[model samples]
Target: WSWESYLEEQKAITAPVSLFQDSQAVTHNKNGFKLGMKLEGIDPQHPSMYFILTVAEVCGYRLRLHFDGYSECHDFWVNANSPDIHPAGWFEKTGHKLQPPKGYFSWSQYLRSTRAQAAPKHLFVSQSHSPPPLGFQVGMKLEAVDRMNPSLVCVASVTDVVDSRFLVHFDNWDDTYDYWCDPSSPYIHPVGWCQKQGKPLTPPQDYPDPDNFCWEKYLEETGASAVPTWAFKVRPPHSFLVNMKLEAVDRRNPALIRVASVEDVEDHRIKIHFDGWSHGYDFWIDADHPDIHPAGWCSKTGHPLQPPL
Candidate 1:
């Protein structure tokens, strides 16, 4: 069987939509905010102190803020008009000084930055309003952002709820993109939201997006045939050394496997870097992920491959 018939064996029409327990409420609608605006916000890590923040993103009414000169993982969101955020220089004006970033810094060092500017005016909302709590329940379907290939949305499920946060799990794959997010994260959307916004919610290639794309019919058009192979795959060695070269599934072009290097071998995983692309596309997968293959496996499997620039 070619790639077409190979997928036909799976009964799902498309990538799975998100599910929430039926007893819970649906997600609430958030308002708009823009990028580059700054705010006096609390640190998710060090909530005890306030710091200057830049509006890295405007997701719904929630403004994803980044603390200047900090790790991106610490980036967080605040409601547009929430009390957590105040106009630029509000810290100085209020006599409640702005705190330093993550590492230790003296009080004098922080107070010395008299030139600090405030977040802009337009970034502020005319009036702040909090979203109604989501009525999400398990089994309710929805669309979600595919963190791996950001632009391509995918179907997700509300597998479990913890502390009122919805646990969204992507379908047709392992638990890679699963995340616990506030019901108002703005990342989750109604089933057709992606199409409505002109953003195509494409699933992983050969996974499920092609509800209408019949494999055999398309193969006839491309004049290429997909043949089926069966074999039980095993895991790689725990000692994947640095600079080791191998085949990797380019996330942006999953149809083409690219040459990759084991850049850094960590505790439980290794960092993979594509030969030609910068670190932008590098990602981490377990030792058993089939995307990485031996030097000649790509050729043996008849999978198209790409090499470094």
Candidate 2:
């Protein structure tokens, strides 16, 4: 019937919300998002810009947001608890240009013709508090997680900073693999972290000689400064056991979330097997991987969870 009842039938224990990096916001939202509600949202393609979005559809705990002035390709789905969604008038208050719907003279005119209203202002809580200060600067070096290859931790430099978020550019690699994130991201670490944790660190794309490469020499040559060790918060330890059941993202079909059980567990990694599926479909992931979540996460976040194959 419901995800809660489904887990109850199996007697499965949901993982604690504290395991997730973004759990603070994930567990706090009122989950009051509704269809046809107008709001302001940041552009994923252009993070600095804010634009108008209408809740085109509403699922359990998610919203399909249609971007004003944009085509279907520009629409996106977000968890009802996501902080990126803002209340109306947020764009003008933040001094960011708000793009109205296509063919509309203004936001007021678009609202009048559609006969829709903005989501209640209380639905957005992110604006109540200022973002925590990260104090990163351009040319500062740190260890960054390679989003393309999640298991690999590489030496990276802060190429730019925007408010509390910063651009991470891997050393010896082109900009194609670069990414952006905030200070509290578990994917970032201080120097020597990989070695301290007994995880192998990936060297840059190319080096004259890997054995001879040293961080000190590289920083000196590039005239870069290492980000202070104190900037990162220590990640909470994840203690997972084999046979533990949870929800996970389907790597093959990323759009699908599924009920899964831990088949094997390593210090920082776990092999996940879809419940009732054969071993052939098993896969390993970091214990704190963003793709894994507590049993009820899919329902709470408005995601549709897939049944066993």
Candidate 3:
């Protein structure tokens, strides 16, 4: 089950092609890339198209990113230091021509059209801390954003874990709404993350006002079974800060899985606000609720993906 054991068993022919660049060559740490955060990136298929991008993963030295206006099929990986990736207005700042994406009047014109701000730099990955310990156990009751209704942050619990990640299931939602995330991903936060940040926190589906409910009594009734730690176990979620975008299932149309914005983050849930969709449709869901998946879950699980809306 360990990576080392798997590598040794394969015993496959290997060569140090030296293709991967030296990690220290750039000598930069804290390459803070947060899942769901939006930025701009170069188009390999259309060199002139300076497309907006959403961060997918932070694997070691590379950042897996996806076309902000496209499908999962268009996602690709690039070194963190690659010149192709740049902040908003990078094209305008450098005077490079932009191949306007469909419906855009012009690169600079479009940039000015919207008032959306980039996720604060601090929300991205930080080198200051190590992975927080896994003090969590399954069957414990907690709050989560219902992927079906990301705008609706609801009650949830840990269901399973795989290495550094753990699965989360909504209390009222069916099993299909369960998904997985890392132990420390910002997407999942403590129960009161939303209220502290002054964001709307939805009550659990069919449940009474979560704020009015007695959390202490609820735990006694649910934990051990709801926590589901007895079910299975992995790596935890990355620390999600804020204003990050991610791939999520459209609760309205479960078949549709597209990019979603992390409007607010909690210890165990995320306020999933869909782009293009009104704030009304935005609901809260857990970092790993089945209603949503990790940025690259489709590719990893071989599921269909919807283009950005």
Candidate 4:
């Protein structure tokens, strides 16, 4: 989609009002605020108006809060402003309002922590398949779901792996922006994901082209800084680097690849690195190889390459 269209779509998805609500009651519990916990409280600038906040650091008597629904992170703090914070239930009695549905907050941000317990086990595929263990190393290739745009399959290489998540070098994506994916997500498929289907799958035609990609236009329209070319360029000294040209396909088949450096090569797959884009990146890739297909080609060429029958 064009940058304008994408922005409009995002705007539509976002709530008209602040997404954050009060989390004071919940955070005050015995457990205390943990790192990565989501909270809700009123914005000091706009008192009595609640906003979502994420726990950044925990200090004595006060927890550092990253106010939600705003651009700058450090701009807002939740200490002095935290006393007024309360849980979602508090809003019901206090008559404080929330944007979107109350459940939306719990589902998207607040609930992620409790998803494993609250959600059905079947929702998450078991980690028993013994897919090769992952380690920290450069040039590892693996399949990852674009966290920002979950539908896209990013063929990435490992640049860094910290704990359970890894940083990847996403093709056709900016290096300044990194992508992060859960190590357990089947969405992080094995490299040669295209070839695993018994035959070398044709590259996705609907992928974005570098020259005229929508992201490029987005930078232009928004006057955003230009991303370094090497960011999307394949990391050197890796396995086969096929420069396959892909064509645009259906949106459902939108092609995107995340290329990560391999740390260790196991039986069927390799432990690779992956990263997350700061602003986010989306595109397609060759199912068989590590080639990126940018959205620009589809817009400029009009006709995308046909997929294999």
lDDT of prediction 4: 0.38
Model 1: per-residue Cα lDDT over 190-285, one tens digit each: 655666788776553465447764334544544432221111122224656666666666667444667667777754366788766888778886
TM-score, cand. 1: 0.27
Which candidate leads in TM-score? 2
Better of 3 and 4 by TM-score: 3
Backbone clash count, each prediction separately:
23, 1, 51, 59
lDDT of 3 by residue, 255-292 (tens): 45665667787666678776557889888765544354
The Cα RMSD in angstroms, rounded to one decimal, for candidate 3 relative to the true structure is 21.1
Per-residue accuracy of model 2 over 232-273 as CA lDDT, tens digit each: 765454677776777887877655778888888766677899
- Candidate 1's C-alpha lDDT? 0.52
Better of 1 and 3 by TM-score: 3
Of 1 and 2, the candidate ahead on lDDT is: 2
Model 2 is weakest, by summed lDDT over 10 consecutive residues, at 19-28
Residue 146 lDDT (model 4): 55
* Candidate 1 clash figure, as a count: 23
Question: Across residues 64-125, which tens digit of lDDT does each residue of candidate 4 receive?
Answer: 56654445443343332233455433444434555432244453444655441222222122
lDDT for position 172 in model 4? 45
Which is superior by lDDT, 2 or 4?
A: 2
